[PDB]
């Protein structure tokens, strides 16, 4: 394996597998060491960490766009969720193979297609539609059986709309697993596009109910306005991601405000309470090593991740990683948020991709953030 770079900052390291098998393409790493990538017409499986050897298992779909799949543990299993088919796929075991499944339909508009999906692995899968409808999908019984259903319908369907454009506010731009709080229960955050975040309770054997709900929109806007008038009118979430890996107090989101020309990205963290159904704006970042332009294509919604937080150990400092399809952005900041003396930002740096990069996976460990490229291979970057 190369180090491409090791600054004192940061490190990029191109992991010892090549991508030479594949000749649009599926997108995931996750910490059981897989990473995996779909065609249109098979999936790819192989251990990131191999070391200079293929071993890649080559499943096969048919005989629209490619599929998004999700690994699931075993009883390895994976999900095949179709887009705009609006059909669902489970197998229990990959090695039970054949090729020469569960099935679910999942009864959707001719209009809308899958948008997001993760796993929340004790409770079930979470289905997010560009109809902003978020679907609560389970594999198992309580005394847990093999088989799938369509559990619980979170969140429903954006309102048949009046007009040509849709609402933008009710987009689903993040799911979030939080921590687990019982037999087959655990915590799921939402968050959209108009800046309302959710905290919802999900259970196999229940009824999954939502804990929270607040709007930081408004609020978030006005602290930004002074110093960015044009915020009105322009500001919109791209992403939100939780800072602790055991608690849903405090969360970080990831934002765009436009002037006319160019798009800039800001960071709020937002600190949750519970008990008084309300929230407080600890401090805001802005991504100065970035922006975009207006008339660029902004369909690569850009993915915010914060490797720390899932780990059960908390770092002093919060190596944060924004992906955009141009560069990954990194920065650092204090896990602290007790705003006294608070230790205020010190670093940030990007690492741009030349433009014949083609990013088509993603993963991050508690260490590390992954990307597959696709005549390149898989990388591993790490901030220090």
């Keep these: 394996t190369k180090i491409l770079t090791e600054t004192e900052k940061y490190s990029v390291t191109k992991l010892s597998t090549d991508l030479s098998f594949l000749p649009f393409e599926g997108l995931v790493d996750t910490a059981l060491q897989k990473a995996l990538v779909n065609d249109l017409d098979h999936i790819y499986i192989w251990n990131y960490n191999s070391i200079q050897k293929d071993t890649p298992i080559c499943k096969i779909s048919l005989h629209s766009s490619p599929p998004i799949c999700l690994f699931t543990s075993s009883i390895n299993g994976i999900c095949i969720i179709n887009k705009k088919n609006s059909q669902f ?198 991504l100065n090593t970035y922006f975009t332009k207006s008339t660029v294509d902004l369909n690569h919604k850009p993915q915010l991740f914060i490797p720390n937080a899932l780990d059960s150990i908390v770092s002093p400092t919060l190596s944060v990683y924004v992906l955009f399809n141009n560069a990954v952005v990194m920065t650092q900041i204090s896990s602290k948020l007790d705003s006294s003396f608070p230790l205020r930002r010190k670093w940030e740096d990007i690492i741009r991709f030349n433009k014949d990069v083609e990013i088509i996976g993603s993963g991050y460990s508690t260490d590390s953030i992954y990307v597959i490229c696709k005549d390149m291979g898989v990388l591993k970057i790490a901030s220090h």
């Design 89 to 286: 796929l489970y197998f229990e075991d990959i090695s039970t193979i054949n090729n020469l499944a569960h099935v679910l339909d999942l009864k959707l508009k001719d209009n809308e297609n899958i948008t997001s999906t993760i796993n929340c692995e004790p409770s079930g899968i979470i289905i997010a539609t560009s109809l902003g409808r978020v679907l609560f999908i389970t594999i198992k019984d309580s005394t847990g059986k093999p088989k799938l259903e369509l559990k619980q319908q979170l969140i429903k369907p954006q309102n048949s709309f009046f007009f040509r454009n849709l609402d933008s506010s009710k987009e689903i731009i993040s799911l979030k697993k939080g921590p687990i709080v019982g037999k087959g229960e655990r915590l799921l955050y939402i968050t959209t596009r108009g800046g309302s975040l959710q905290i919802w309770q999900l259970s196999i054997n229940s009824k999954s109910f939502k804990r929270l709900e607040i709007n930081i929109y408004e609020h978030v806007l006005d602290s930004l306005q002074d110093l960015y008038p044009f915020a009105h009118g322009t500001l919109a979430f791209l992403d939100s991601h939780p800072i602790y890996s055991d608690t849903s107090s405090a969360h970080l989101t990831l934002a765009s405000i436009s002037n006319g020309n160019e798009i800039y990205y800001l960071m709020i963290t937002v600190i949750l309470d519970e008990k008084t159904n309300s929230f407080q704006i600890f401090s805001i970042y802005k």
